[PDB]
Write a protein that binds this ligand. Structure first.
Ligand SMILES: [Mg+2]
Ligand SMILES: [Mg+2]
Ligand SMILES: [Mg+2]
Ligand SMILES: [Mg+2]
Ligand SMILES: [Mg+2]
Ligand SMILES: [Mg+2]
Ligand SMILES: [Mg+2]
Ligand SMILES: [Mg+2]
Ligand SMILES: [Mg+2]
Ligand SMILES: [Mg+2]
Ligand SMILES: [Mg+2]
Ligand SMILES: [Mg+2]
Ligand SMILES: [Mg+2]
Ligand SMILES: [Mg+2]
Ligand SMILES: [Mg+2]
Ligand SMILES: [Mg+2]
Ligand SMILES: [Mg+2]
Ligand SMILES: [Mg+2]
Ligand SMILES: [Mg+2]
Ligand SMILES: [Mg+2]
Ligand SMILES: [Mg+2]
Ligand SMILES: [Mg+2]
Ligand SMILES: [Mg+2]
Ligand SMILES: [Mg+2]
Ligand SMILES: [Mg+2]
Ligand SMILES: [Mg+2]
Ligand SMILES: [Mg+2]
Ligand SMILES: [Mg+2]
Ligand SMILES: [Mg+2]
Ligand SMILES: [Mg+2]
Ligand SMILES: [Mg+2]
Ligand SMILES: [Mg+2]
Ligand SMILES: [Mg+2]
Ligand SMILES: [Mg+2]
Ligand SMILES: [Mg+2]
Ligand SMILES: [Mg+2]
Ligand SMILES: [Mg+2]
Ligand SMILES: [Mg+2]
Ligand SMILES: [Mg+2]
Ligand SMILES: [Mg+2]
Ligand SMILES: [Mg+2]
Ligand SMILES: [Mg+2]
Ligand SMILES: [Mg+2]
Ligand SMILES: [Mg+2]
Ligand SMILES: [Mg+2]
Ligand SMILES: [Mg+2]
Ligand SMILES: [Mg+2]
Ligand SMILES: [Mg+2]
Ligand SMILES: [Zn+2]
Lengths: 120, 50, 69, 91, 114
RNA sequence: CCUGGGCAGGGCGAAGCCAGAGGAAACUCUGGUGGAGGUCCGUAGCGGUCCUGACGUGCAAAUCGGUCGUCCGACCUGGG
RNA sequence: AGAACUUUGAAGGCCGAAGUGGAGAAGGGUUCCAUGUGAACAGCAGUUGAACAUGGGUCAGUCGGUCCUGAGAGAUGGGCGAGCGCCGUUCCGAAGGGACGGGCGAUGGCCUCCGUUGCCCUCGGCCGAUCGAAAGGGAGUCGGGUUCAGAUCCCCGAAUCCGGAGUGGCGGAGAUGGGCGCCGCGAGGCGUCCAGUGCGGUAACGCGACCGAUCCCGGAGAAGCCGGCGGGAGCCCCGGGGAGAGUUCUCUUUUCUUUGUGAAGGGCAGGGCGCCCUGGAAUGGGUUCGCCCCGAGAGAGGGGCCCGUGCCUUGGAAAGCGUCGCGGUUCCGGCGGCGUCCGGUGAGCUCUCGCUGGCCCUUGAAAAUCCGGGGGAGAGGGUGUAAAUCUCGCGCCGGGCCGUACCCAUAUCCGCAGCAGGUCUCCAAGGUGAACAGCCUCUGGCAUGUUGGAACAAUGUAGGUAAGGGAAGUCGGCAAGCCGGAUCCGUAACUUCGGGAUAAGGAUUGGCUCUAAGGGCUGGCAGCCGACUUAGAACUGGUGCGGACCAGGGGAAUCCGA
C-alpha cells in the first residue's frame, strides 16, 4: 500500500487506461473553481491590506477574477504588475503636463502682479 | 386546502381587559400593521368590514 | 468537584463540620488535599512541599486523615 | 451566454407537456419568481410566500398580494373604484 | 474500527435519540446521549426576527435551575423585547400621546372660537 | 388520517449572476458560474418482462438463478 | 465401551463492515446458565443440542411505562328507540366545590405568637368527564470492577433533578448612609431629622441575591424536503519516539497491536449574530461556491451577547491499558518498575452544529409543563434597632409501583417443521476502484447449511468452448454472444427548439523514467513546508494494455398509448 501510494505520489499508475470514472468524478470542476478562485481572491486581499492595490482597482480585478479571465496566480500577479506599470506612466505624464501648466500659470500670475505694481 | 390567505387580526375587548384574536379572510392589498376598522360608521377603505 | 485556590478557604472548609474525609495525595510535582464534605469534593492542589508540611501541621487533629499510597 | 432561446425558465421541464402550455406557464413562472419593489422600505425584497402572500425581507411587513403578481390589474381597478366611491358625494 | 452500540432500548434514530460519541477513561469509545438544544426567546410578533440577547438558551425545565440574572435583561421589557422594540414603543407612546394633547387643545380652541 | 425511519455514486446542464466581443441603436454572440427536474445509467429498497429456465408428491398450498422496470419521488415502510 | 460430526492445538477456506459481526422494537416465554443421562425427539450419529431430569438467574429518583395530547374512541346533559340500547361531543345543560384579600364566630398548640373550621363580600370561557404513542412532547448518571447466568440497576468513586422546612438550620444580600448641635487634640461617642424593596457600563448588556396578588401579553415546547459551504468530534493516512511479537535463503532504521480522560463546575480557543457606539461612502464600495449588503448607515476602528459536544484544570491515575519481574495451595477488583509520547495534512467517510439558497394552487400538529415582561392591589423595621423576601452559597430528609435473562434469526418470531419464503432499525475498517458497486484482506463469527465413502455411464440441472457459413432452424434473433469504463475528434432525419445523443463512426489505454503547471507560512522581492490532479516527452515488453471484476449492440421504419 505504501509503495503504491508513493508511486501515485510520483505520478505512476495514472494513465488513460486506468481511469474508470469521469473527470468531474476524479477531480470536481466545482472544487477546482473553489480552490482557484479562493486563492486568486485572497492574494488580492494580501496585496490590498499591505501595500499593493488600492481601493478602486481592487473591485475591478475582483470582478475580473469572478469572471473566467485570470487562469492562475502567476498571470494574476503579472497583470497586477502591468496595471501598476501603466498607472505609473499615466501619473508621470500627467505630472509633467501639470508641471508645465503650473509654471506657465505661475509666470502669468507673477507678470500680472508686476503689471499691477506698474498700474498702482 | 385554501388558496386564499388567512389574516390574523387581534382586537380589544371593550368589556373585560383582554386582547381577542380572530381570523379574517385577507383582502387584497392589506399589510401587517394596517388598522382594520369595523362597525357601522367606519370609513370605507379596503379591508374594513361594515 | 470544586478546586479551591486560596489556602485559608480550604482551611476554613476543613474546619467546617460535616466533612468526614480528608485525603492526602503526594505526586512527583505537587500534592493534592481532598475534602469529601457532602456530595462535593474539594481539592487544594499546591506545589510547595514546605507549605504542604506546614498545612499538615496546621491541620485539625480531631478529623481523620487518609493518605493515598 | 444565451444557452436557451425559447424555453427560458421552463427548460427545467424539458420535452413534456406541450409548447402552448409551456408558453402560458413561462410568463407566470417569471412573475412568481421575480423580485418586486417593496412599497414600504423601497427595496426589491418581495419574495413569494404561499399563494397570495408576499413578504419583504427588510422591515418584515407581510402583504397580501395577487396569486402570481404583486398586484392584479383587476384589483387595481377595484382599488380605483373604491376610492372613487369613497370621495364621490361623501359616501 | 470499534463499532459501537446503543445503551437504551431505543433502536430507531428518532428526534429524542440525538446523540454523540465520546471516549471513556478506560480506553473505550462509548455512545453518549445529548440533550436537545434549547433556543433563546425571540421577537414579540412583528419586528425583525432574531433571538433575544443575554438569555441562557436552555429548556424551560432548565429555566427552573436558571436564576434571575441569566433569564432577563435589567431593562423593563427585558426578556420580551430586543430593545429596538423598547426604543420604538417609548417614542411611539410619547409622540402619539403628545399629538393627542395637541388635537385636544386644538378642539378646545375650536370650541372657544366657535 | 396521525406519528416516526430511509433512499451509494456518476450523465444531461434551467432560471439568476460575472467577464469579454460586435453594432449607430434595437439587440446579438462567446467563456465561466449556478445547481433546476413527477430528468438519464445504476446500488440498497419496491415490483415482476423473458428464458413460457429450475423445481412442479418442490425449500415453498407461488419459491429460486440469470435477464429485468423504477430508484427525490404519483417513492418504500414500522406503530396507532 | 464406542468419533467423518464433541473439545483443544495446527493447516487450508468462507461470510469481508449493505456480514454468516456487535445490539434492539414486535413476536417467543425459560428457550438464558451450570450439572448429570443419552431409551424418546435432532430426518445418519453423538460423549453434542433449543431433548430429558435437577438447581439457579432479571436488583433503577436520573432506561422506559406511568404525565400530556395527535388521528380518533367515548359517558353524563339532550334526542331517538318495542328493546339490549343507538346518535352526538358542544349541540337544547343551574355542567367551576377552587382561590387572593377583608370582616365575624369557635377550637387547638408555649393563648407570646400562630394553625384549622363555619358564614358573607369579591375574583375565576371549561373550547367541556375520561382514554389514546415502550419510535411524538417529556427535568435529571456517568467512569471502573463484579458472576457459570446482571448491568447506566449490584460494589467503589464522582454528579444531577424534583418536593419538604411551622419554634421560620448556617451564612450572604436586603444593610446600615448623609446632615445639624455638644464633648473630646484626635480616633470616636451622644441628642435629633431624613433616606435606604441592589449596583455599574453612553451603549449592546454584566454581577452572588434583587418584595410581588387577581389580571393581561409574549416566548419555549413547536416543526417539511433538497442543494451547497464552513467549524467541531470519531474513524482512516504519513513522519519520529517508547513497549511487545513476526521474517532474515538475501535485503529491509523493516512489518503487526497499542500510545487515556466520563457526567458535572471554572478558564481559554473556534464558530455565529438581522447586537451596540464612533463614523459618513459615488471614481461606488465590502464580501460568497452561489449569492447577498449598504444613506432605514457600507468599509474601518472599538465593544457586547450565544453555542462552546474543542483544549487545560478538580474529577484523574490511587483506577484502566501495554510490558517485565516477585510472594500466597487458594482466598486478596495481589506487590514493585517503566511507558501510556511529539507533530503534519486532507475534493477522505459518518455524526453534529451554524450560515445561506431553492422547491409549493403541497406551508409542513397540538397539549401537558416552564419562564420572562407590563401592571403596584398589598406587606414589613422604622431607628443608632433590625425586619418583610431571595430565582445566591451551603446543610438535612425522601423519591412509591411495574419491565429489566435470552433469540431478534438460512435454528429461540410467523408459515403444521432446525422450511432457499416473509418481518421494522443503529454502528461501520484497509486496498483497487467515481462509488455503501464487484473482488481480495483486518476486528469479529462459521463449518458449507437435515449425511459420509468409491467411480466419473446414459439422461438431466447450472458454466464454458468449438474449423467454415452467419439466422439458411424456429410462428418469431427464443436463448446465447458482440459494443460496454475512461480520454480526444465528430455527430444525421425530425422537432413542442428543450431534445434525439453515451446518435452513428474513428484513435489511445500496460510498465518504468523524467519535464511543466495548479499552493501554504515568515522578513522590509527573498527564504522554509506539503496534497493529488492534468498535460507533454523518452525507453521497453511476443500489438500487449477497462488485461480479473465493474459493463449501453446499433440503425431505418409502421400501429397504439403523449
Ligand atoms: Mg459545473
Ligand atoms: Mg420517547
Ligand atoms: Mg425520473
Ligand atoms: Mg434516453
Ligand atoms: Mg434503458
Ligand atoms: Mg413476485
Ligand atoms: Mg422472478
Ligand atoms: Mg416456466
Ligand atoms: Mg421432477
Ligand atoms: Mg435493475
Ligand atoms: Mg439494468
Ligand atoms: Mg430511471
Ligand atoms: Mg459435513
Ligand atoms: Mg476441529
Ligand atoms: Mg447485521
Ligand atoms: Mg442453552
Ligand atoms: Mg437421528
Ligand atoms: Mg454429558
Ligand atoms: Mg425441558
Ligand atoms: Mg444508586
Ligand atoms: Mg425516564
Ligand atoms: Mg356513543
Ligand atoms: Mg342521556
Ligand atoms: Mg393519558
Ligand atoms: Mg447480558
Ligand atoms: Mg459501567
Ligand atoms: Mg431543591
Ligand atoms: Mg463538515
Ligand atoms: Mg476534522
Ligand atoms: Mg466537560
Ligand atoms: Mg439484556
Ligand atoms: Mg428461515
Ligand atoms: Mg429469510
Ligand atoms: Mg477506503
Ligand atoms: Mg483512488
Ligand atoms: Mg449506513
Ligand atoms: Mg438450517
Ligand atoms: Mg463456430
Ligand atoms: Mg471460428
Ligand atoms: Mg456476417
Ligand atoms: Mg439475410
Ligand atoms: Mg415462419
Ligand atoms: Mg434474450
Ligand atoms: Mg468469441
Ligand atoms: Mg435517412
Ligand atoms: Mg434515437
Ligand atoms: Mg400511414
Ligand atoms: Mg404509457
Ligand atoms: Zn420591506
Amino acid at each position: 500500500c505504501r509503495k503504491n501510494t508513493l508511486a501515485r505520489r510520483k505520478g505512476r499508475h495514472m494513465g488513460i487506461g486506468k481511469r474508470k470514472g469521469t473527470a468531474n468524478a476524479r477531480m470536481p470542476e466545482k472544487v477546482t473553481w473553489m480552490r482557484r478562485m479562493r486563492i486568486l481572491r485572497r492574494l488580492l486581499r494580501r496585496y490590498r491590506e499591505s501595500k499593493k492595490i488600492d481601493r478602486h482597482m481592487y473591485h475591478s480585478l475582483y470582478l475580473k477574477v469572478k469572471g473566467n479571465v485570470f487562469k492562475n496566480k502567476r498571470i494574476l500577479m503579472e497583470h497586477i504588475h502591468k496595471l501598476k506599470a501603466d498607472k505609473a506612466r499615466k501619473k508621470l505624464l500627467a505630472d509633467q503636463a501639470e508641471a508645465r501648466r503650473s509654471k506657465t500659470k505661475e509666470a502669468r500670475k507673477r507678470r500680472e502682479e508686476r503689471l499691477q505694481a506698474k498700474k498702482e | 386546502g385554501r388558496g386564499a390567505p388567512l389574516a390574523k387580526v387581534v382586537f380589544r375587548d371593550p368589556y373585560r381587559f383582554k386582547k381577542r384574536t380572530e381570523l379574517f379572510i385577507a383582502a387584497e392589498g392589506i399589510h401587517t400593521g394596517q388598522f382594520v376598522y369595523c362597525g357601522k360608521k367606519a370609513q370605507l377603505n379596503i379591508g374594513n368590514v361594515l | 468537584p470544586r478546586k479551591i485556590e486560596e489556602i485559608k478557604d480550604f482551611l476554613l472548609t476543613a474546619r467546617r463540620k460535616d466533612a468526614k474525609s480528608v485525603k492526602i495525595k503526594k505526586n512527583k510535582d505537587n500534592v493534592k488535599f481532598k475534602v469529601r464534605c457532602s456530595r462535593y469534593l474539594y481539592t487544594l492542589v499546591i506545589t510547595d512541599k514546605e507549605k504542604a508540611e506546614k498545612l499538615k501541621q496546621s491541620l485539625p487533629p480531631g478529623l481523620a486523615v487518609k493518605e493515598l499510597k | 451566454a444565451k444557452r436557451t432561446k425559447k424555453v427560458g425558465i421552463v427548460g427545467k421541464y424539458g420535452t413534456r407537456y406541450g409548447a402552448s402550455l409551456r408558453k402560458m406557464v413561462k410568463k407566470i413562472e417569471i412573475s412568481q419568481h421575480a423580485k418586486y419593489t417593496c412599497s414600504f422600505c423601497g427595496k426589491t425584497k418581495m419574495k413569494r410566500r404561499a399563494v397570495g402572500i408576499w413578504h419583504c425581507g427588510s422591515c418584515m411587513k407581510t402583504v397580501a398580494g395577487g396569486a402570481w403578481t404583486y398586484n392584479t390589474t383587476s384589483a387595481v381597478t377595484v382599488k380605483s373604484a373604491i376610492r372613487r366611491l369613497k370621495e364621490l358625494k361623501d359616501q | 474500527v470499534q463499532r459501537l452500540t446503543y445503551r437504551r432500548r431505543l433502536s430507531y434514530n428518532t428526534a429524542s435519540n440525538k446523540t454523540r460519541l465520546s471516549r471513556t477513561p478506560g480506553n473505550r469509545i462509548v455512545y453518549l446521549y445529548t440533550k436537545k438544544v434549547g433556543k433563546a426567546p425571540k421577537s414579540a410578533c412583528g419586528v425583525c426576527p432574531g433571538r433575544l440577547r443575554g438569555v441562557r438558551a436552555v429548556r424551560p425545565k432548565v429555566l427552573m435551575r436558571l436564576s434571575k440574572t441569566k433569564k432577563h435583561v435589567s431593562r423593563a421589557y427585558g426578556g420580551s423585547m430586543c430593545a429596538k422594540c423598547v426604543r420604538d414603543r417609548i417614542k411611539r407612546a410619547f409622540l402619539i400621546e403628545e399629538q393627542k394633547i395637541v388635537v385636544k387643545v386644538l378642539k378646545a380652541q375650536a370650541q372657544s372660537q366657535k
